[PDB]
Amino acid sequence: WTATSGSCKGRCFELQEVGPPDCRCDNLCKSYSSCCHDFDELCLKTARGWECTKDRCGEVRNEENACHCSEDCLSRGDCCTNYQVVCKGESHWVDDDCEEIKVPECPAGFVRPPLIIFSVDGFRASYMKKGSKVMPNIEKLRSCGTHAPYMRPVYPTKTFPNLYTLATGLYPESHGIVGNSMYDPVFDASFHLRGREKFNHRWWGGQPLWITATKQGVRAGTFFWSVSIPHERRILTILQWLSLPDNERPSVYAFYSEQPDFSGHKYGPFGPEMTNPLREIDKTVGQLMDGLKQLRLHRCVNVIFVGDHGMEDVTCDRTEFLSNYLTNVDDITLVPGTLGRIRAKSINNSKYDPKTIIAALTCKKPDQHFKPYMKQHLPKRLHYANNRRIEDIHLLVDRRWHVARKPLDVYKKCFFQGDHGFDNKVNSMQTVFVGYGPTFKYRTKVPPFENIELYNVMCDLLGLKPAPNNGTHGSLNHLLRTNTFRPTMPDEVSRPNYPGIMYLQSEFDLGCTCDDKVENKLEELNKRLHTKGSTKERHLLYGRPAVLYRTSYDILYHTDFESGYSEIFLMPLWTSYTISKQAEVSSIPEHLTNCVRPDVRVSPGFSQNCLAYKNDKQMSYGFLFPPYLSSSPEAKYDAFLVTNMVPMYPAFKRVWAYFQRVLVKKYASERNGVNVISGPIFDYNYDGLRDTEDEIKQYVEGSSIPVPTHYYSIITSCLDFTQPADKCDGPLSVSSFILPHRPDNDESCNSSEDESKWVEELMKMHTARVRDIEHLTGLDFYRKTSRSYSEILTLKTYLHTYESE
Ligand SMILES: *[C@@H]1O[C@H](CO)[C@@H](O[C@@H]2O[C@H](CO)[C@@H](O[C@@H]3O[C@H](CO[C@H]4O[C@H](CO)[C@@H](O)[C@H](O[C@H]5O[C@H](CO)[C@@H](O)[C@H](O)[C@@H]5O[C@H]5O[C@H](CO)[C@@H](O)[C@H](O)[C@@H]5O)[C@@H]4O)[C@@H](O)[C@H](O[C@H]4O[C@H](CO)[C@@H](O)[C@H](O)[C@@H]4O[C@H]4O[C@H](CO)[C@@H](O)[C@H](O)[C@@H]4O)[C@@H]3O)[C@H](O)[C@H]2NC(C)=O)[C@H](O)[C@H]1NC(C)=O
Ligand SMILES: [Ca+2]
Ligand SMILES: [Ca+2]
Ligand SMILES: [K+]
Ligand code: NA
Numbered sequence: 079w080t081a082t083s084g085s086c087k088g089r090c091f092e093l094q095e096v097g098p099p100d101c102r103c104d105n106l107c108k109s110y111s112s113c114c115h116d117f118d119e120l121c122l123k124t125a126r127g128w129e130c131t132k133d134r135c136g137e138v139r140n141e142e143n144a145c146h147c148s149e150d151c152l153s154r155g156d157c158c159t160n161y162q163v164v165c166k167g168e169s170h171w172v173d174d175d176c177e178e179i180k181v182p183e184c185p186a187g188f189v190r191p192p193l194i195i196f197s198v199d200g201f202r203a204s205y206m207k208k209g210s211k212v213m214p215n216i217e218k219l220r221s222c223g224t225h226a227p228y229m230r231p232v233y234p235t236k237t238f239p240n241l242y243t244l245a246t247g248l249y250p251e252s253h254g255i256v257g258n259s260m261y262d263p264v265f266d267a268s269f270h271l272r273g274r275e276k277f278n279h280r281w282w283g284g285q286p287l288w289i290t291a292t293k294q295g296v297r298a299g300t301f302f303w304s305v306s307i308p309h310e311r312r313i314l315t316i317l318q319w320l321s322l323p324d325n326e327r328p329s330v331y332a333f334y335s336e337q338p339d340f341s342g343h344k345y346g347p348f349g350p351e352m353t354n355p356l357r358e359i360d361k362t363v364g365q366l367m368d369g370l371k372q373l374r375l376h377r378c379v380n381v382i383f384v385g386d387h388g389m390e391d392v393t394c395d396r397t398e399f400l401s402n403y404l405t406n407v408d409d410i411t412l413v414p415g416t417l418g419r420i421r422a423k424s425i426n427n428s429k430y431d432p433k434t435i436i437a438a439l440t441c442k443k444p445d446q447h448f449k450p451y452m453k454q455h456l457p458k459r460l461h462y463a464n465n466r467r468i469e470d471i472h473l474l475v476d477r478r479w480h481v482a483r484k485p486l487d488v489y490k491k492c493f494f495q496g497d498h499g500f501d502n503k504v505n506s507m508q509t510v511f512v513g514y515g516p517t518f519k520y521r522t523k524v525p526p527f528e529n530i531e532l533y534n535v536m537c538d539l540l541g542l543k544p545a546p547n548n549g550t551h552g553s554l555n556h557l558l559r560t561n562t563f564r565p566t567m568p569d570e571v572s573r574p575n576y577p578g579i580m581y582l583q584s585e586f587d588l589g590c591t592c593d594d595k596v597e598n599k600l601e602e603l604n605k606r607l608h609t610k611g612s613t614k615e616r617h618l619l620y621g622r623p624a625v626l627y628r629t630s631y632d633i634l635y636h637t638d639f640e641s642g643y644s645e646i647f648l649m650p651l652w653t654s655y656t657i658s659k660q661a662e663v664s665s666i667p668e669h670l671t672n673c674v675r676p677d678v679r680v681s682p683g684f685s686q687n688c689l690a691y692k693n694d695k696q697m698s699y700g701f702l703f704p705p706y707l708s709s710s711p712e713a714k715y716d717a718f719l720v721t722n723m724v725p726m727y728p729a730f731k732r733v734w735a736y737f738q739r740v741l742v743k744k745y746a747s748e749r750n751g752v753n754v755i756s757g758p759i760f761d762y763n764y765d766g767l768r769d770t771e772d773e774i775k776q777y778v779e780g781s782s783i784p785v786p787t788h789y790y791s792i793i794t795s796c797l798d799f800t801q802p803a804d805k806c807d808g809p810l811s812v813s814s815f816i817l818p819h820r821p822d823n824d825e826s827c828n829s830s831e832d833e834s835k836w837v838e839e840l841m842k843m844h845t846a847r848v849r850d851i852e853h854l855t856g857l858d859f860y861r862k863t864s865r866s867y868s869e870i871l872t873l874k875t876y877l878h879t880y881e882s883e
């Protein structure tokens with residue numbers, strides 16, 4: 079109930095909302111059917127439109143007009159935004175040459191440069207180039223300020239998840255806005271684009287920018303705008319708020335536009351109809367900037383121009399139907415379109431089986447335009463598992479396609495020509511970033527970055543302490559002129575042991591054998607030095623990874639590789655080796671095929687044993703340092719140490735062996751050497767974070783050898799590929815992956831073929847940031863380089879995407 083009988087007299091666009099039954103006058107009142115009776119009349123005036131004209135200059139104040147051109151407007155804070163240009167002969171902001179803003183030039187009473195975030199829905203990255211000719215205001219922001227070629231959204235590339243991510247710095251699995259449509263089973267309640275359930279606060283987790291500011295004494299403009307408030311009115315309202323008294327005036331503001339998403343859905347991303355909405359957004363930017371110029375705030379405010387996601391060509395004829403795969407299509411509920419989320423229709427149907435749904439959806443048709451995944455098997459880069467609102471079964475839809483349950487869902491809902499929601503590495507999904515202002519750099523291009531990183535920057539811009547989030551604070555310091563955040567490296571928590579030779583061969587009863595009984599003071603001292611770390615400078619190029627949790631581990635040196643060996647997990651946490659451009663690849667000699675050797679530095683009690691692998695009919699083993707890349711027949715023996723072995727399913731070994739035998743050498747040839755760090759990951763609860771021992775769900779049969787859920791590799795070289803990786807003076811280049819350790823290759827529909835036709839494709843899908851691996855392992859990499867820490871943080875957030883230009 080709303081007593082709509084009160085008035086908005088002197089309260090239009092009030093910041094502090096009022097509580098029912100009292101009627102509202104804030105910028106969401108329309109959305110709630112709660113505005114006082116006179117809100118339209120008073121707060122949504124449109125008379126005479128939005129632009130001063132020569133004749134109106136100096137007019138008598140008619141309170142009825144949408145904006146004013148009368149002499150006193152600048153003092154009331156309510157002039158039309160072109161007032162000074164039309165009436166007072168000033169130039170539009172966009173006609174002004176750009177001049178570096180070295181310092182904020184703010185009116186008296188301003189305690190910090192305000193921030194205005196100008197958000198645009200569905201603003202695909204390539205519009206900056208393709209629409210350049212019709213967006214002069216945005217082009218000026220872009221060219222004069224700081225911009226990225228693109229900004230990467232989060233998955234799913236839908237509006238609500240992305241805007242909330244921008245506002246929180248969190249992945250959707252952590253803020254809880256996991257799609258535009260959702261069912262939460264604990265609440266037993268559904269979130270929809272339409273209607274009122276979406277307004278309950280229990281859906282929206284984390285702490286968004288406007289709460290962060292208020293909690294720390296920084297006032298905020300409201301970030302949500304009811305759809306029916308026209309853009310011109312939104313801009314005028316922001317400008318009005320900027321003329322409030324110091325003690326009342328917000329320091330952070332946001333504008334939202336539904337375009338160009340709205341027209342993109344109708345016409346596709348580059349439909350001829352798309353030019354006009356681009357034109358209209360640009361004009362809105364111009365109004366804002368002219369208005370700031372009128373207020374003498376154009377060299378005071380930081381402005382961010384940012385999109386939530388891009389847009390792809392999608393038509394109703396590119397739809398796959400689950401009725402063409404499933405016998406029991408009525409037994410499931412699908413969240414449809416550019417992603418799929420499946421669960422049972424009835425929690426009382428005990429004949430529901432995910433296993434059979436997944437099998438029926440896997441590689442059943444040659445051209446299949448989606449792939450099914452149990453959510454924990456999704457690429458870790460998606461961070462899309464750890465929320466009860468995310469259904470166990472997920473469909474990753476090919477770009478340009480939809481999935482639906484039955485044909486009838488499409489035509490009893492071709493209408494539309496664009497959509498979005500696909501894999502966030504897809505080129506069409508990429509969106510935009512521009513920063514303009516005294517705190518941003520001048521005429522600066524930065525590399526692409528992920529939208530999770532902006533919350534921290536927005537906090538830096540306002541002098542706020544960010545709430546805990548998924549950004550890496552400091553990784554975007556290169557965008558900023560000032561207010562940079564200077565973190566320290568995290569402290570190492572566990573120091574390693576450095577064991578020497580402590581065990582005789584006969585103390586080991588592991589059930590392992592090796593044909594190695596083949597016996598020189600020249601090379602006997604040499605091998606000693608290798609075991610004491612003499613080649614470590616070669617193989618450990620950026621220092622040892624630091625262990626950020628309490629544990630017991632040993633550093634093991636070898637000729638060709640260095641490792642950090644866990645006494646708890648009985649295998650390495652990390653193995654580090656460097657392969658030059660000139661390295662030769664060799665085979666595992668016939669005589670050593672099944673060779674496994676006791677490590678006389680590591681107790682039998684803290685070692686794996688071969689008998690467990692023999693008795694586990696499902697599980698095999700591989701090596702972290704690859705015996706194929708041994709520097710000499712003699713050094714190859716190090717590679718068969720029990721301390722280099724890890725559990726591997728035979729299906730996985732196909733992947734791993736191709737990686738090790740072919741791809742590492744390929745990268746070394748292409749990148750002029752590479753440094754490789756590889757290791758296990760355990761993430762049985764699919765939270766993105768290192769498991770403790772008690773979370774481990776699977777062990778090699780009859781033993782305490784835990785089974786990894788994934789294997790990672792970090793592959794580093796010199797960004798200037800004229801310098802060898804092991805003698806690099808400057809910035810580094812990285813590519814990494816987190817490969818799922820699965821007992822089959824059902825993910826790869828071409829896996830019956832030779833590994834050259836499908837392995838690298840898999841690996842590319844499971845590309846990762848170094849930071850993803852750090853979260854997953856409790857390790858901190860690149861501790862000892864000659865580069866600044868912020869530069870290293872940027873490197874750790876890098877994702878090698880494998881998309882074209
Ligand atoms: C990305 O960044 C984020 C933010 O830093 C990282 O997420 C954090 O990770 C922490 C560890 O995973 C997690 O810590 C837990 O917090 C519990 C208290 O949490 C509540 O309060 C905070 C503060 O106000 C709030 O942020 C939380 O918000 C979550 O939950 C509400 C719903 O109630 C949601 O609306 C909201 O979106 C958010 O959900 C997300 O997180 C929850 C888990 O919190 C997930 O389940 C969701 O799927 C979703 O992702 C909460 O309201 C705290 O109680 C936990 O403490 C346990 O563990 C300690 C270990 O020392 C132990 O000593 C305690 O005893 C305790 O265990 C007891 O409870 C267990 C469960 O019943 C039980 O098993 C035990 O037996 C014990 O009884 C824990 O510390 C932190 O809350 C989130 N924060 C956020 C915002 O998500 C995230 O990891 C980053 N991602 C990556 C990949 O790095
Ligand atoms: Ca959107
Ligand atoms: Ca975990
Ligand atoms: K076996
Ligand atoms: Na397969």
Ligand SMILES: [Zn+2]
Pocket residue numbers: 200237339340343498
């Ligand atoms: Zn859309």
